[PDB]
Every structure is written in C-alpha cells, then in structure tokens.
Motif scaffolding. Structure first.
Motif, PDB file in Angstrom:
ATOM      1  N   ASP A  45      37.722  25.053  -0.222  1.00 44.96           N
ATOM      2  CA  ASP A  45      38.902  25.256   0.634  1.00 44.96           C
ATOM      3  C   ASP A  45      39.425  23.886   1.125  1.00 44.96           C
ATOM      4  O   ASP A  45      38.635  23.035   1.537  1.00 44.96           O
ATOM      5  CB  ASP A  45      38.543  26.172   1.834  1.00 44.96           C
ATOM      6  CG  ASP A  45      39.714  26.373   2.820  1.00 44.96           C
ATOM      7  OD1 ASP A  45      40.648  27.129   2.504  1.00 44.96           O
ATOM      8  OD2 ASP A  45      39.719  25.775   3.910  1.00 44.96           O
ATOM      9  N   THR A  70      34.966  31.780   7.083  1.00 46.77           N
ATOM     10  CA  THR A  70      35.556  31.437   5.783  1.00 46.77           C
ATOM     11  C   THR A  70      36.139  32.704   5.128  1.00 46.77           C
ATOM     12  O   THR A  70      35.691  33.825   5.422  1.00 46.77           O
ATOM     13  CB  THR A  70      34.520  30.796   4.796  1.00 46.77           C
ATOM     14  OG1 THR A  70      33.729  29.800   5.467  1.00 46.77           O
ATOM     15  CG2 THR A  70      35.226  30.145   3.587  1.00 46.77           C
ATOM     16  N   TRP A  71      37.143  32.496   4.246  1.00 41.12           N
ATOM     17  CA  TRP A  71      37.751  33.546   3.406  1.00 41.12           C
ATOM     18  C   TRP A  71      36.653  34.333   2.663  1.00 41.12           C
ATOM     19  O   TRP A  71      35.896  33.758   1.874  1.00 41.12           O
ATOM     20  CB  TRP A  71      38.725  32.908   2.375  1.00 41.12           C
ATOM     21  CG  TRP A  71      39.689  31.896   2.964  1.00 41.12           C
ATOM     22  CD1 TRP A  71      39.574  30.531   2.914  1.00 41.12           C
ATOM     23  CD2 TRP A  71      40.894  32.164   3.710  1.00 41.12           C
ATOM     24  NE1 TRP A  71      40.628  29.943   3.566  1.00 41.12           N
ATOM     25  CE2 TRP A  71      41.450  30.919   4.065  1.00 41.12           C
ATOM     26  CE3 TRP A  71      41.559  33.333   4.108  1.00 41.12           C
ATOM     27  CZ2 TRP A  71      42.630  30.807   4.797  1.00 41.12           C
ATOM     28  CZ3 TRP A  71      42.733  33.222   4.836  1.00 41.12           C
ATOM     29  CH2 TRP A  71      43.259  31.964   5.172  1.00 41.12           C
ATOM     30  N   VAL A  73      36.424  36.249   0.171  1.00 43.12           N
ATOM     31  CA  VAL A  73      36.927  36.612  -1.181  1.00 43.12           C
ATOM     32  C   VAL A  73      35.851  37.335  -2.018  1.00 43.12           C
ATOM     33  O   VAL A  73      36.076  38.433  -2.542  1.00 43.12           O
ATOM     34  CB  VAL A  73      37.418  35.316  -1.954  1.00 43.12           C
ATOM     35  CG1 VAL A  73      37.964  35.643  -3.371  1.00 43.12           C
ATOM     36  CG2 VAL A  73      38.465  34.535  -1.121  1.00 43.12           C
TER      37      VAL A  73
END
Length: 89
Positions: A45, A70-71, A73
């Motif tokens: 990122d 954090t993302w 995903v």
C-alpha cells in the motif's frame, strides 16, 4: 481481478529499507503494509506497483490496531501465510 497464490496477509507490517544515493547506509521507514508478495518484489500500500524485496524488511506490529488497520482484500489466514516476527517490545 481474482488472482491468488500463497502470499503474506494483506496488512503485513513491514518497513521500507531505502536511502537516496549518498554512499550512506539504507534507512527504514514504516509501518508499511504488504498486500501481495511476488518473487523478490512486494506489492505494498502506497507504492506504484512493486518494491524490490531487498528494500523491504518485516516488522513487529506488537498487536491490536497496528497490523489490523489495512484493506481486508484477502484478510484470511489460510490462502495467505506469514512467519514468526522478531518479537521486539
């Protein structure tokens, strides 16, 4: 896209070991978060696409909302695996 492989978890708490060419030693900044790993190149990122892994080094988040922020995903402890951190208070 839906490309998967055994990478480190999205949110891998690392530092970026980098320095402007002054002949002086490489300097860490952090905490950066690896979303995907590739052979000798990590997709992090804040990065354009990849940083050559020699300019990255794993860190100890300690716990709580450090590695967690954090993302999410591929945040799943089965396709993505990490290893034992340094353990540093």
């Amino acid at each position: 896209h839906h490309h998967h492989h055994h990478s480190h978890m999205v949110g891998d708490t690392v530092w970026v070991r980098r320095h402007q060419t002054k002949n002086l030693e490489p300097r860490w900044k952090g905490p950066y978060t690896v979303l995907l790993t590739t052979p000798t190149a990590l997709k992090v990122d804040g990065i354009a696409a990849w940083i050559h892994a020699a300019h990255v080094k794993a860190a100890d988040p300690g716990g709580g909302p450090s590695s967690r922020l954090t993302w999410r995903v591929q945040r799943s402890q089965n396709p993505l695996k990490i290893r034992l951190t340094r353990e540093a208070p």
